[PDB]
Subunit: 217 residues, 2 copies
């Protein structure tokens, strides 16, 4: 168990790059799914906190102490919930949708390499039993100058295979930097929202203590 | 505009108590509605934060720095979300459902007073034109000893009306103490959840900084 079985062929290396990419793509699609589920669950929570606070504000009467303070600290909350939801669906989400979207076009390129490969081997075979069955050394019919056509499938496959041998691992390595940056944004957005919202709720706690002390004596 | 129009009859005072009670009941039903909406919106948010964090934990690899720390700080979060949702549906909610539930049985009692009143006036009328049309002073038919029956409707109304004249304002005054106590629980539950969850997310922020610094040099 180690860091690259050193006896692999170039094709076996390519396959390993494929397993990694399939897995990278499955992991980003899942993150985008769950995060999109989180956002609307958040949005709906924002909405419910608002209609609930609108109630607390309604049933708490003007003439009681802390009333204007309550209106105020409630409005402060509406705004934190809105930064939070903006930052999630914009700053956090869009990079996720962008990183996630580069995978389908890469898969398309890989399926183009795999296709160009069975066409090229399909002409190596086809042209090797053209050399055998029909060729005399002295005459090349224009039929064995579909040799020019074989060099097309091989020039065309070569460039693609080579590009994928660099492009795939390159993309795989991008995974770390992508996540450190996305999660940094996500975790900071969460931190700020939760910590400011906390400051608000202890303000609200305090206000309600003063009404509890006054109305009790 | 003042604190009790001092020229009111006892009935006009009762009516004012009714307006206050109807309003107290409409405000508690609304609070219970919105708060129940908040709870399931919260519950669903808990669920979504969990499946999302399970993703972050999946896509973050064992071999990277901070990985076990991530698992850990994530589990810590699952539990805060669970205190929060327990405390909302139990400590905050049940007193709300209990305070809210005393209103329908009070309304039933008020509709019993109002009913007993139109029966009693309905016999004052009925028995005043029994005194008139048929009564000679010298003979009481056993028909004007449904006078005993009138004193039933008036004894029975008297006790109810009197009980409501004390019970209704008593309940109205309970409104302040109820809310200071319910909101104290609610706001503290919120405070603790948000402030602890904040501590978790800056831990998560820090972990991800260390992976960003290490993987970058």
């Amino acid at each position: 168990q180690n860091l690259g079985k050193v006896d692999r062929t170039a094709d076996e290396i390519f396959d390993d790059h494929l397993n990694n990419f399939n897995r990278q793509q499955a992991s980003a699609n899942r993150l985008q799914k769950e995060f999109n589920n989180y956002i609307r669950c958040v949005r709906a929570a924002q909405a419910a906190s608002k209609t609930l606070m609108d109630s607390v504000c309604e049933i708490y009467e003007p003439q009681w102490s802390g009333y204007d303070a309550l209106q105020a600290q409630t409005g402060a909350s509406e705004s934190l919930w809105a930064d939070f939801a903006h930052k999630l669906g914009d700053q956090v989400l869009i990079p996720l949708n962008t990183y996630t979207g580069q995978f389908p076009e890469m898969k398309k390129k890989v399926e183009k390499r795999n296709r160009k490969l069975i066409d090229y081997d399909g002409q190596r075979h086809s042209f090797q039993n053209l050399q055998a069955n029909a060729n005399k050394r002295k005459d090349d019919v224009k039929l064995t100058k579909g040799r020019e056509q074989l060099e097309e499938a091989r020039r065309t496959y070569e460039i693609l295979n080579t590009e994928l041998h660099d492009e795939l691992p390159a993309l795989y390595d991008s995974r770390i930097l992508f996540l450190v940056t996305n999660l940094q944004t996500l975790f900071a957005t969460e931190q700020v929202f939760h910590n400011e919202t906390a400051k608000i709720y202890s303000e609200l706690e305090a206000i309600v203590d003063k009404l509890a002390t006054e109305s009790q004596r």
